[PDB]
Amino acid sequence: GETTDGVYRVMTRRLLGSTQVGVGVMQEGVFHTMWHVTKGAALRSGEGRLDPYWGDVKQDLVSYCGPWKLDAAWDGLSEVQLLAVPPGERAKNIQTLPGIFKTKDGDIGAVALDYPAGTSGSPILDKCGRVIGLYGNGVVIKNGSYVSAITQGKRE
C-alpha cells in the first residue's frame, strides 16, 4: 500500500478499541521498527501487506520489505531530537543531550525521556533530520524513571 517516507504508528484491532502497540520509520521503501513491538509479525498498510525481511531479538530491531536502510549515528557530542509519536497524541520533537550506556561490548547513546510504552519505535534525529537510532529499549534507573538507548542497525 502506502510506502511514503516518514514516521508511522503500529496499531492493533486485537483488543478493546484500536490500541497503539508501537511506532516505526519508513525510508527507501523499508519499514523500520523495534522487534518487541510487532514480534516479527506481518503488518498491513491499507490493503497492502508488509512482510518481514530481517530481524534480531538481541538488537531488538526488525525491517520490512527490504534490508535495514538507516545508517547514521550520534557523534557523542551534539544534542539530538526524539521525534516522539505518543498514543492518542500528535507527533512531537523533543530536544535533549544524550547519555551513555557503558557496556562490555562498547558505549551506546541514551535518552532520559519517559513516554507510554506505545511510543516504542520512535526515531532519534540528528541536526540534519537523519535517523541515528530508535527509542523504546533501555533500562529503569533507581529514580523509577526510564532511560532508553539509541538503537541503530547495520546497513550492507
Binding site: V21, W35, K58, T103, K127, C128, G129, N137, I141, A149
Partner: protein, 39 residues
Amino acid sequence: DMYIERAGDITWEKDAEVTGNSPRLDVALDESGDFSLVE
C-alpha cells in the same frame, strides 16, 4: 493483523521543547535483548 498509519515527516524542528538529562550508566545486554543495570 497489525496495521500502520502515517503520523508525520522526519524533520529536525528549530525552536523545540528542550528537556532531559545526560546520565552515564553501567548496563549489560542479554541474549533476549533486555538491558539490566549493573552496579
